[model samples]
Target: LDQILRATVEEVRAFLGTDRVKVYRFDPEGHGTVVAEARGGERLPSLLGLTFPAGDIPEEARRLFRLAQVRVIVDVEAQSRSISQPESWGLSARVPLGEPLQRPVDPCHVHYLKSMGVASSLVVPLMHHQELWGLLVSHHAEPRPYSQEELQVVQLLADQVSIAIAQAELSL
Candidate 1:
């Protein structure tokens, strides 16, 4: 599993062209645990061994994760400008704040992208056996809106990650 996860992290880093990438899983109780992480460009040690409790995620985010296919947040400052203690919004305040999409953004993820200096972000939910398993959080330092082509590529990368994770779990 370690070998496959390491290989997968390298592949994701290459595809996203970012400095950092992480895979997090939510336990049955909704706690987030970092399972895999990789760094490129300038190194960031904070994410290497961090785990966020469910409190780190807002309630709105939990619901969004339950209902949406994908969630994103474009600018954190802009969102915070509108609301006081923006992070408190939990799920509702954590969104990309742009055009409508097929899926709503995950609130827990909103704070993460904002805190990471990620001008743009993508969170792809990984599901197995109709149960929520984990998420792939992709980050970009610059505020470049994700192009449709990029989204497709990310989806493909996420698919591979999902398959690898499933294989690992089954073996376990």
Candidate 2:
């Protein structure tokens, strides 16, 4: 399991050319721990083996990621300008539920990442048995945007990692 996860993070970090990449697993209680990580430049802080509180990832955000699979934040600074429509009907009507728009980053999360010197991030959810298992995360020190094709590549990699996780568990 360690070998597989280490290789996975290295591959993703190389592909994304980001300062840091990690495989973060979420426990049943919503807490997250970094299982594997790869670091490039000296810019981003190391988070390997670190655990984050459940409050760091709100319930609503987790629900959305479970439904969406992937999310990209081109610039954390731009989060303040993003907005979401209310659940209740207003002057505007609901748009067709297609590809998710670039939803606003949570203020708390943005602040936390900023403190860590991360300017942008791309997150791919790892699903196992129809449940959110963990995340494949890429972090950049500068604002970084991924092309649609690149996003697809990361999503494919995330899928592969999910399979690896299932196989590893079966062997345990």
Candidate 3:
């Protein structure tokens, strides 16, 4: 199952044509912590033990997260409604689930991403047994909106990821 999970991550990376793919699960303390991650190019430090601060995600974002079963943010910028809070990835805006809205990354993030040669990204909710498990975040070095086909593919991949995590837990 571990090998399969790693393979799944690599496959997702190829499918998204991105530099990195990470899956962070919501822990018992209501914080998302990195559990499974895969990188294609230059390896970054392992975030396996890192935890995202509660403040990083505001109340509105959490509300949207809980309500929306599948969150698809094509872009992180250009959204008129954005919470005034610091983001973990320095993202400026967030497009909740059930919305087709898409925007570019925030200027701050863009500058940093550029330095790392990252330009675009997409994030999807990972649910298992009808419960929110974690998230699948993908990054690209060029500006591009997730095409309908690409969106469907990633969402499908998320479903598979959920199953993989569930299997891992059951075995444990």
TM-scores of the candidates are 0.73, 0.84, 0.69
Kindly indicate the candidate among 1 and 2 with the higher TM-score: 2
For model 3, the superposed segments whose C-alpha errors exceed 4 Å read: 1-4, 43-46, 70-81, 84-100, 103-118
lDDT of 2: 0.74
lDDT of 2 by residue, 126-152 (tens): 877667778887877776566779777
Candidate 3 per-residue lDDT, tens place, 89-126, comes to 32222443434465333355445545554445666767
Where model 2 places Cα greater than 4 Å from the true spot, the runs are: 79-100
Residue 172 in candidate 3 has what lDDT?
Answer: 70
Sort every candidate by TM-score, greatest first: 2, 1, 3
The whole-model lDDT of each prediction reads: 0.65, 0.74, 0.61
Error of 2 at 2 (Å): 3.4
